[PDB]
Amino acid sequence: MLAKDKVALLIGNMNYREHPKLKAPLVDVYELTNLLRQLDFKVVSLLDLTEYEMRNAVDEFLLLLDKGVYGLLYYAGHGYENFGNSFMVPVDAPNPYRSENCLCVQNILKLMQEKETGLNVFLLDMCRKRNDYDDTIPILDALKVTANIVFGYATCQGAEAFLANGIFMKFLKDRLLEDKKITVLLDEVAEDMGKCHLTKGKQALEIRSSLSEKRALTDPIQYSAESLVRNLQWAKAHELPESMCLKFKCGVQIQLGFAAEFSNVMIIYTKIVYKPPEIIMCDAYVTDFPLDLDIDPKDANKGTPEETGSYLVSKDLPKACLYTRLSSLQKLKEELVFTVCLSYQYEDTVEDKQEVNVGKPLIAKLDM
Amino acid sequence: MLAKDKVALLIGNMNYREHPKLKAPLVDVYELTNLLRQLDFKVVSLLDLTEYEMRNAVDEFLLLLDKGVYGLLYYAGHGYENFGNSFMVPVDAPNPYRSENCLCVQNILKLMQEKETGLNVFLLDMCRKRNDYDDTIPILDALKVTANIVFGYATCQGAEAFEIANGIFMKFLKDRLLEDKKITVLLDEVAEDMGKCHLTKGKQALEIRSSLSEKRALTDPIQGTEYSAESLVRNLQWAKAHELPESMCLKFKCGVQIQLGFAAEFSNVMIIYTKIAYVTDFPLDLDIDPKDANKGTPEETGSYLVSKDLCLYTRLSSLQKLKEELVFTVCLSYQVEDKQEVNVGKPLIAKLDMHRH
Numbered sequence A: 001m002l003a004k005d006k007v008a009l010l011i012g013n014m015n016y017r018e019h020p021k022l023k024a025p026l027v028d029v030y031e032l033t034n035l036l037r038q039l040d041f042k043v044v045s046l047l048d049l050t051e052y053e054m055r056n057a058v059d060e061f062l063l064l065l066d067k068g069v070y071g072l073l074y075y076a077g078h079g080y081e082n083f084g085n086s087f088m089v090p091v092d093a094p095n096p097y098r099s100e101n102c103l104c105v106q107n108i109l110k111l112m113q114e115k116e117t118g119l120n121v122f123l124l125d126m127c128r129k130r131n132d133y134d135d136t137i138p139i140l141d142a143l144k145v146t147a148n149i150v151f152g153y154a155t156c157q158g159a160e161a162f163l164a165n166g167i168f169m170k171f172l173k174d175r176l177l178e179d180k181k182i183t184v185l186l187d188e189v190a191e192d193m194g195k196c197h198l199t200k201g202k203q204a205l206e207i208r209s210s211l212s213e214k215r216a217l218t219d220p221i222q223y224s225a226e227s228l229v230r231n232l233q234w235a236k237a238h239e240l241p242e243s244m245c246l247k248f249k250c251g252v253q254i255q256l257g258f259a260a261e262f263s264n265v266m267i268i269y270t271k272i273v274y275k276p277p278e279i280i281m282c283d284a285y286v287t288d289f290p291l292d293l294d295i296d297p298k299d300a301n302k303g304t305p306e307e308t309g310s311y312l313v314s315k316d317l318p319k320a321c322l323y324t325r326l327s328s329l330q331k332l333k334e335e336l337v338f339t340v341c342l343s344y345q346y347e348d349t350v351e352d353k354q355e356v357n358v359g360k361p362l363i364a365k366l367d368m
Numbered sequence B: 001m002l003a004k005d006k007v008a009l010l011i012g013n014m015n016y017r018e019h020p021k022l023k024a025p026l027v028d029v030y031e032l033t034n035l036l037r038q039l040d041f042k043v044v045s046l047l048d049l050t051e052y053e054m055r056n057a058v059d060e061f062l063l064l065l066d067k068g069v070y071g072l073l074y075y076a077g078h079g080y081e082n083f084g085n086s087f088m089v090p091v092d093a094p095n096p097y098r099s100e101n102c103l104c105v106q107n108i109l110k111l112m113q114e115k116e117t118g119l120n121v122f123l124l125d126m127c128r129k130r131n132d133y134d135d136t137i138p139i140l141d142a143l144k145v146t147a148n149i150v151f152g153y154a155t156c157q158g159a160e161a162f163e164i165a166n167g168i169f170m171k172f173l174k175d176r177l178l179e180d181k182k183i184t185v186l187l188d189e190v191a192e193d194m195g196k197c198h199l200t201k202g203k204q205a206l207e208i209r210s211s212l213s214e215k216r217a218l219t220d221p222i223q224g225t226e227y228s229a230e231s232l233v234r235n236l237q238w239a240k241a242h243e244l245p246e247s248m249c250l251k252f253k254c255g256v257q258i259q260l261g262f263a264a265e266f267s268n269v270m271i272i273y274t275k276i277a278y279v280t281d282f283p284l285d286l287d288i289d290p291k292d293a294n295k296g297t298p299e300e301t302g303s304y305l306v307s308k309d310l311c312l313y314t315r316l317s318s319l320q321k322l323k324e325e326l327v328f329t330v331c332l333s334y335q336v337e338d339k340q341e342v343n344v345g346k347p348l349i350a351k352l353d354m355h356r357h
């Protein structure tokens, strides 16, 4: 079979303000992004989205899916299942949450079908228990027999989905690259989960499929004018700032470098590249970040990138630096302008600062 | 993989009292029964059941299940799907009907999991639209994670499972059911067959819902004899399920000799045939309309069976309502009128006394 394009939206919610925090979405969204990139998928990987951001990511994602396009949606975070319907809980959801606060996966499904997609895959890596607080039970004028929808739930209905992978991604990542029909592939991952001593009687993956064709994530991509609008927009979506050298008044030169962690998460690192022998104590640190980004000023300027909450370990980046993680690039509405500070001793410590403008990095370039 | 046993309950509802009548269940239940028998399944195939009869049949099927047993439910008839749950509408359901009139499939599955079954297959050949008269919101008891459940729906959710001869689902299922493939994989190839065929592509699509985590197939061999006070009950109940009356010869005072024969069509359906003479005075619970009895051909009784497979033929299709022994009269008119009463016990599913539940 042929695919017009292969596009994926991966959402990983961990830092909830009113609900317990999660760990697995960080490793699983990162690892799934890499495997999907290997399968020639254009992937958008988003961490910690509010209801507003989640709705805008799903809506803009639909305004990319076209006739014959293979679309994949992966969600990892707090979730619930009420009367057949699945809901994904945003990080800003109140306590308790109701369906108006969350996104119904069945609503996403029907809107994808109105784009005539060639394959719709939904991987829901979440708990499927009932939400006692949901007064409404939505009845959709459900279905359109497109015979191309595959759902892979991490667990069964009324059960739980338990720097390490979650149970679903642990088994899924070992086979995702195989050249088999996605239903056959998901069924083999279920057999793998079954063989695991840990899952027996607790977690089992459930597959709901109406796929009537041999369609796989390994299908080659077949070009249209409308495809070039999403191809150009996707090229602009992951541009990273170039590493810049900053020369200070005292002779100290600093390298300021950038790494992509997710489509909305960036690592900023500072390194002292030249130090005049006359200077003994020398520290460089970043401050004055846009308030939109809501960066914790203490989870900045860490000796290792793990301390910032990053997936990337010390040996994954240029080494012997100071790391700062900006995990909310979707909230940036202006240009990324901040201050680089230099403190140095030769009795009084000496300070000097330089302002740096690095434009709108990664998903911020997509003016939303 | 190995199975303790392979047990199937097939229900085909067509003669609805207050709803449109159906046609396909007769041919589809008959042919699915024969396929599952080739795979060594103990099959109980029943047609036209009331709410009371379907609950009784489900309790009789559940007594045939034990730990590691492959259980299969196939239903063809009127059905509906509300709030994630599938309901099977019995032939005596009123118009309109509610959940308390029907049998919920998930309730049956929950009972099968209490039996520690090794495989649970549900092949639901019915429409999946909402019943707008059922205001009932499921409780519901969150099912155990047994990782051995396979649903095979004839259509997608909110769509109709219209019929055209076999029904669409059984037509595609018949070509594949005998293969040594994992049931989820086998069902998935059937879905591809329906999508490949020109006159079904776009109009009807199979839906497969599955949590099976082991390579279990309807072709798996059955393990050796289990020696317990539970296997002795289960087998001595199955040995009485399909007993057919022995062919008898009746001699009359005028010298005439008539052969009385019997044939099984379903677990609750038996044809009676007389060769040189008409049969009458059947038990009232059987509801045998004399206008349908004593036909020159079995096709005139409404039987699946034709002249070639087997005189005067009488179709007894409600054997599950037989609460006492089957006593009837063989009348003989000649040129004047003589009669002889015949007792043939409780044939087929009648010997199981399902009314016990």
Ligand SMILES: FC(F)(F)c1nccc(N[C@H]2CC[C@@H](Nc3ccnc(C(F)(F)F)n3)CC2)n1
Pocket (backbone or CB within 6 Å): A006, A007, A008, A009, A042, A043, A044, A046, A049, A052, A053, A054, A056, A057, A058, A060, A061, A064, A230, A231, A233, A234, A237, A264, A330, A363, A366, A368
């Ligand atoms: F969530 C949020 F950050 F708040 C947010 N706010 C506003 C929009 C928005 N859009 C999301 C992320 C960007 C995506 N843009 C493209 C473009 C081309 N091809 C692809 C694909 F990779 F999917 F094929 N994606 C579309 C979905 N997200």
